[PDB]
Amino acid sequence: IVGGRRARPHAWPFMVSLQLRGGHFCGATLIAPNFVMSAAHCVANVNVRAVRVVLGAHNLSRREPTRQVFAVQRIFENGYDPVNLLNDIVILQLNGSATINANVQVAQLPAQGRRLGNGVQCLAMGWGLLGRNRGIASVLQELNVTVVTSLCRRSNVCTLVRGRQAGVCFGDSGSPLVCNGLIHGIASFVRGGCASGLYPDAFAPVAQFVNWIDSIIQ
Amino acid sequence: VQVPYTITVNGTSQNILSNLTFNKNQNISYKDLEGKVKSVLESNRGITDVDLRLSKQAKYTVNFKNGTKKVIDLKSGIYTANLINSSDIKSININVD
Ligand SMILES: *[C@@H]1O[C@H](CO[C@@H]2O[C@@H](C)[C@@H](O)[C@@H](O)[C@@H]2O)[C@@H](O[C@@H]2O[C@H](CO)[C@@H](O)[C@H](O)[C@H]2NC(C)=O)[C@H](O)[C@H]1NC(C)=O
Ligand SMILES: *[C@@H]1O[C@H](CO[C@@H]2O[C@@H](C)[C@@H](O)[C@@H](O)[C@@H]2O)[C@@H](O[C@@H]2O[C@H](CO)[C@@H](O)[C@H](O)[C@H]2NC(C)=O)[C@H](O)[C@H]1NC(C)=O
């Protein structure tokens, strides 16, 4: 997240860090005690047996006893198209169920088909790079963004920060976009680099997949 | 670690066999990978940034240790917002025109 701010500790208890040997590589969202939701491109080219799902984290550079760590037992995709970056969503079933508490909570999802109009105010978040240069964040970052429909696609939810170089960056893929308390987006891709100030960031549109999500998580 | 790569230009490259250098287990982005591909395009064949923009097509394919591949268009300016473990890359094939 470029141009954001630190989140207050555990403000977003559905937020998930997906990790490999070298640490965080993607975000995700807890959508049931034993399911998290991320971008399909986050795991298409990785060994899913090696992925660790870290719940209840805040500062990735510290040992945090509030953390719960799971492996991925099964994945579910729904027609992912990596060339056109369409249907960029994956559900990861954990090898167990999270213990729900103040720090680990399940996110709420919108109704099937709900489409956000131009101008809706949202919040992005993640542990991605803090700038086009510089490295991943330690503390979870959040950023006020606005839904936009110009320079977008109907198959995406896109967001912009007016008149500033701010937006998602590398390592933010898979992270939720929260609008009116609901998870409306999964970070997918950027254009012309991070935080160009010109091209909106693109999110997979969660509301278009709710019937499928519900069939998997019951 | 060493990662082999190939460069094909107008279909008629593929003579040269050498490697790229990555840090073991380090997470990198596709913008990082783009810069490495553009660097070896220039040093190995003198194909500059200007040359890439003037080309009809310019792509590279990343082959991964899990058997999958990802095809990146060097002219699209699109980047997925993920990080990738450099140890998961098996090889890279670059194709200009
Ligand atoms: C569910 O899986 C977690 C995570 O397993 C680790 O990470 C996986 C990606 C894979 O690399 C596994 O081989 C790893 O063990 C288990 O958490 C581990 O539990 C063991 C025993 O309790 C403990 O010694 C490790 O430190 C834990 N690892 C981490 C990263 O927390 C967990 O035990 C599994 N759940 C059940 C019910 O078996
Ligand atoms: C920046 O965003 C925060 C967070 O609320 C977000 O915006 C909402 C419209 C909706 O998308 C939520 O799901 C998001 O999480 C804003 O905080 C809110 O501010 C109003 C007025 O001050 C207050 O009544 C709410 O309770 C606040 N909600 C929370 C969760 O703090 C904040 O106002 C935004 N800042 C700017 C400058 O737009």
* Contact predicate A114/A179, CB 8 Å: no
Are residues A116 and A101 located together in one domain of the fold? no
Closest listed residue to residue A59, CA positions, set A4, A6, A21, A109:
A6
**In angstroms, what separates the C-alpha of A146 from chain B's closest C-alpha?**
19
Nearest partner of A109 among A215, A213, A16, judged by Cα = A213
Task: List the strands of the sheet with B2-9, edge to edge.
Answer: B18-21, B2-9, B89-96, B58-64, B69-73
Question: CA A97 → CA A6, A10, A93, A103, distances in Å?
Answer: 28, 19, 9, 14
**Cα separation of A207 and A213, whole Å?**
10
For the CA of A51, the nearest atom of ligand 1:
9
- The count of structural domains within chain A is 2
A97 Cβ inside 6 Å of ligand 2:
no
Report the structure determination method: X-ray
The phi and psi torsions of A174 (rounded to 5 degrees) equal 90, -15
- Asked if A86 and A31 sit in the same domain, the reply is yes
Same domain assignment for residues A121 and A159: yes
**Cβ separation A189–B79 shorter than 8 A:** yes
Q: Which residue of A has its CA nearest to B69?
A: A45
Q: Are residues A76 and A41 in the same domain?
A: yes
Residues A36 and A123 in one domain: no
Q: Indicate if the alpha-carbon torsion angle B51, B44, B97, B7 is positive or negative.
A: negative
A144 lines ligand 2 (CB under 6 A): yes
A137 and A67 in a common domain: no
Locate A21 and state its tokens: 């040997």
Residue A216 CA, ligand 1 centroid: distance in Å: 24
Helical H segments across chain A, by residue range: 210-217
Are A102 and A150 found together in one domain? no
Count Cβ atoms within 10 A of the Cβ of residue A176 and give its class: 0-12 exposed, 13-18 middle, 19 or more buried: buried
Q: Helix (H, G, I), strand (E, B), or coil: what is residue B40?
A: helix
Q: DSSP states of A146-165 as a string?
A: EEE-TT--TTSEEEE-TTS-
**Distances from the Cα of A142 to the Cα of A150, A206, B38, angstroms:** 23, 19, 33
B8 strand-pairing partners? B95
What residues flank ligand 1, with Cβ below 6 Å? A 50-52, 69-71, 95-96
Q: Identify whether residues A130 and A102 lie together within a single domain.
A: no
* Substitution site in A52, A63, A72 for ligand 1 pocket (most atoms within 8 Å of beta carbon): A52
**What are the residue numbers of the active site of A?**
41, 88, 173
Q: How far is the centre of ligand 2, averaged over its atoms, from the C-alpha of B49 (Å)?
A: 43
CB contact under 8 A, B70 and A25: no
Query: For residue B66, what are the CA distances in angstroms to A202, B3, B23, B26?
Result: 27, 15, 19, 17
Ligand 2 centroid, distance to A4 Cα (angstroms): 14
Q: Judge if A52 and A133 occupy the same domain.
A: no
**Matching residue, tokens 């380090």:** B26
Q: What total number of domains does chain B contain?
A: 1
DSSP letter assigned to residue A144: E
A26/B82 Cβ within 8 A: yes
Cross-strand bridge partners of residue B78: A191
Q: Which residue from A155, A169, A151, A156 is spatially nearest to A27, judged by alpha carbons?
A: A169
A181 Cα: distance to centroid of ligand 2 (angstroms):
9
Q: Are residues A8 and A32 in the same domain?
A: no
A38 in contact with B at a CB cutoff of 8 Å? no
Contacts across the A-B interface (CB distance below 8 Å): 91
* Backbone gaps in chain B, preceding residues (C–N over 2.5 A): none
DSSP tally for chain B: helices H, then strands E: 2, 8
Query: Are the C-beta atoms of residues B44 and B7 closer than 8 Å to each other?
Result: yes
User: Are A116 and A142 members of one domain?
Assistant: yes
Nearest to A94 by CA among A59, A124, A51, A63: A51
Q: Which range marks the domain in which residue A159 is found? A: 1-12+107-207
Radius of gyration of chain B (CA): 13
Which domain does B19 fall in, by range? 1-97
A148 and A71, same domain (yes or no): no
Strands A201-205, A182-191: pairing is antiparallel
B31, B68, B83: residue with CB nearest A193: B31
Specify the 3-state DSSP secondary structure of A20: strand
